Amino acid sequence: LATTLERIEKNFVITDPRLPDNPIIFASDSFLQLTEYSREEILGRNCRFLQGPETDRATVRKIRDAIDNQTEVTVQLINYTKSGKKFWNLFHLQPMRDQKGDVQYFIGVQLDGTEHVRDAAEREGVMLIKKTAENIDEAAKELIKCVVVGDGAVGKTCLLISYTTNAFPGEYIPTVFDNYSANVMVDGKPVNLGLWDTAGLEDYDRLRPLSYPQTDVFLICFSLVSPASFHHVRAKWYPEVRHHCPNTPIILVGTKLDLRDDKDTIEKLKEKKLTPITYPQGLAMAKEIGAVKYLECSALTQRGLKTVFDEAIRAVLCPP
Ligand SMILES: Nc1nc2c(ncn2[C@@H]2O[C@H](COP(=O)(O)OP(=O)(O)OP(=O)(O)O)[C@@H](O)[C@H]2O)c(=O)[nH]1
Ligand SMILES: Cc1cc2nc3c(=O)[nH]c(=O)nc-3n(C[C@H](O)[C@H](O)[C@H](O)COP(=O)(O)O)c2cc1C
Ligand SMILES: [Ca+2]
Ligand SMILES: [Mg+2]
Fold first, then answer.
1. How far apart are CA 112 and CA 78, in angstroms?
2. Torsions phi, psi for 227 (to 5 deg)
3. 258 has binding-site annotation
């Protein structure tokens, strides 16, 4: 079918207006190059970070008004790179609607230059960016939406960071919402996967479901070394997901696989009169909640990590 997003060699972002402050959920390589930001630095944030001292605030208000009214707009305004380099941005914004006809995303295309353009030059630029926006809209239809839920501190953010950047973040900072992207080869075909990271904390219960509409697959995560997090799969995560999304495939993911055989961890659990969750126990839970797959992984060693996302995609593309 249609091209994937990574083949569109233009500056653009896609945002999710259902989440607080309409954050970026996809950014093109060209946009990264233009703006000097890393992908993780800007995914999960509102695009206003591009603005600065010389930006015309009236023009910014036009953009806000268009977003609020869910209509397209085309403007020119001064923006800045991460290092403070000024550029002119011939900017086009348009809503992307789902099958029903409701707004699902906003698409924004930037044509960068060194001055405000007019007459013929303006007309040419506007035509180019509008065409680009239409190509993005077609390609974005196949963006797979995967939402990751589970208790606080089970490793949701670490596994996303490990998978998408091969690093390990370490120092625990609780998440509100954040987003990650991956282009994954599945049976020799490129697939764009969007990953919505969410807050495990119960006090975020009223916000979390803002991420749920139009989800293609859920990963419900629990730590293999926290029996409480495992029990919460049955008591909390499964029922919450099913309440909003009765028919969406779930993959059950056991995290921190590397700690299941860790001597200190086993000893600490023993002090609490507990033991790690075993593979057979995790599998039985998966069957209980009707998960299409049960998988184990470590963000630290990356063991099993690739398979998680490969199977998330297959759960959507290859539904038996
Ligand atoms: N040994 C080991 N530690 C891990 C692994 N994954 C996460 N951790 C540790 O667990 C802590 C919590 O990880 P996070 O990914 O931030 O937890 P979270 O699930 O995103 O928590 P919330 O954002 O609050 O919902 C991290 O500080 C890591 O040090 C892992 O695979 N192996
Ligand atoms: C799809 C999308 C792309 C955007 N791209 C830019 C951009 O390239 N440059 C910019 O200055 N603002 C951009 N914005 C506008 C800001 O995100 C924000 O909507 C604007 O600053 C007005 O809202 P605010 O007053 O709350 O900041 C974009 C918005 C969306 C929805
Ligand atoms: Ca981010
Ligand atoms: Mg997190």
1. 9
2. -55, -30
3. yes
Q: In what order do the strands lie in the sheet with 24-27?
A: 24-27, 12-15, 103-113, 86-97, 73-80
Closest CA to 229 of 240, 218, 221: 221
Query: By what method was this entry solved?
Result: X-ray
Q: How many CB atoms lie within 10 A of CB 318?
A: 10
Counting ligands in written order, the one closest to the CA of 163 is 1
CA of 45 to the centre of ligand 3 (A): 7
Q: Which backbone phi and psi does 112 adopt, to 5 degrees?
A: -85, 145
Residues whose beta carbons lie less than 5 angstroms from ion ligand 4: 156-157, 175
- The CA distance from 75 to 55, in Å, is 12
Q: What's the gap in Å between 27 CA and the centre of ligand 3?
A: 11
- Structural domains of the chain sorted by starting position, each given as residue range(s) with its CATH number in brackets: 1-142 (3.30.450.20), 143-320 (3.40.50.300)
Residue nearest to atom 3 of ligand 1 (CA): 256
Residue nearest to atom 27 of ligand 2 (CA): 48
